[PDB]
Amino acid sequence: MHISSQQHEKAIKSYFDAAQTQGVIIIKEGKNLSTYGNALARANKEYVPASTFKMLNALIGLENHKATTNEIFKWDGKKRTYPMWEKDMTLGEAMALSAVPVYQELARRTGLELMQKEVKRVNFGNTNIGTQVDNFWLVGPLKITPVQEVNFADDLAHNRLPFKLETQEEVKKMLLIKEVNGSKIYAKSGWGMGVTPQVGWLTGWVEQANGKKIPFSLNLEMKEGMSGSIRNEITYKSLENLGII
Numbered sequence: 001m002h003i004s005s006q007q008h009e010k011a012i013k014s015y016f017d018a019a020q021t022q023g024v025i026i027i028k029e030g031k032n033l034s035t036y037g038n039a040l041a042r043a044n045k046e047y048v049p050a051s052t053f054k055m056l057n058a059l060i061g062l063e064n065h066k067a068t069t070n071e072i073f074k075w076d077g078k079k080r081t082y083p084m085w086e087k088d089m090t091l092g093e094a095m096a097l098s099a100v101p102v103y104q105e106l107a108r109r110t111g112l113e114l115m116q117k118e119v120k121r122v123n124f125g126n127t128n129i130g131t132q133v134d135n136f137w138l139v140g141p142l143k144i145t146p147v148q149e150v151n152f153a154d155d156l157a158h159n160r161l162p163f164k165l166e167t168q169e170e171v172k173k174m175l176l177i178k179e180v181n182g183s184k185i186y187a188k189s190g191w192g193m194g195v196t197p198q199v200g201w202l203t204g205w206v207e208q209a210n211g212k213k214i215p216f217s218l219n220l221e222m223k224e225g226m227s228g229s230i231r232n233e234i235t236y237k238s239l240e241n242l243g244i245i
């Protein structure tokens, strides 16, 4: 392709600049990590994983028979932050809606002791979950870097995490968020509502027509009144600019 790296870099930086935030998107092609965006130093800084942790919470719960993929987690009938969460759902539906209460139930079934063992076994982020099994991914102490998130996505895309192949395939099926021509984007969003500043994530991979998998992790600051879809919009524009989709 004829486009200079200077032009790619400028373009992707401009997507973050135009959203009036600061962020980075890391793309991995084979073993090579490339960092783009308007705040490149964010790449090895630690942030809460927020709802990106649902990927690992689901792997842990399924591997340890705390749930099945068809099990319906019933709404308890209490008011929730979003009306869309006031319904009964499977893990997959809860992944797509980022329904925190379903994943809090799953975490409680797993329990603190097992959760800390599994998070250590996977070597996710700083690996510390502290003492509160139902919010450790939302308010600390668990933290992870964008480089660590893209490497996690790389591991899951290639079935390299230390879970059964079937467990990994089950969770991957929950993560399909877009199809663009013959490309599929598998990813999970994150929004750290309970930290300041608030972190936004979109971490996953592109599966191209030919079967090549290109992992990515977008990380930015979510500003007052910003819409969640900005994470998706910047990610898709960046991937399209690079010709990945």
Ligand SMILES: *[B@@]1([O])O[C]C2=C1[C]=C([N]C(=O)OC([C])([C])[C])[C]=[C]2
Residues within 6 Å of the ligand: 050, 051, 052, 098, 100, 135, 138, 139, 189, 190, 191, 192, 193, 194
């Ligand atoms: B997740 O990042 O995706 C959407 C979302 C997610 C987490 C939360 N809740 C949350 O952070 O709860 C506290 C810690 C603010 C109480 C809401 C929506």
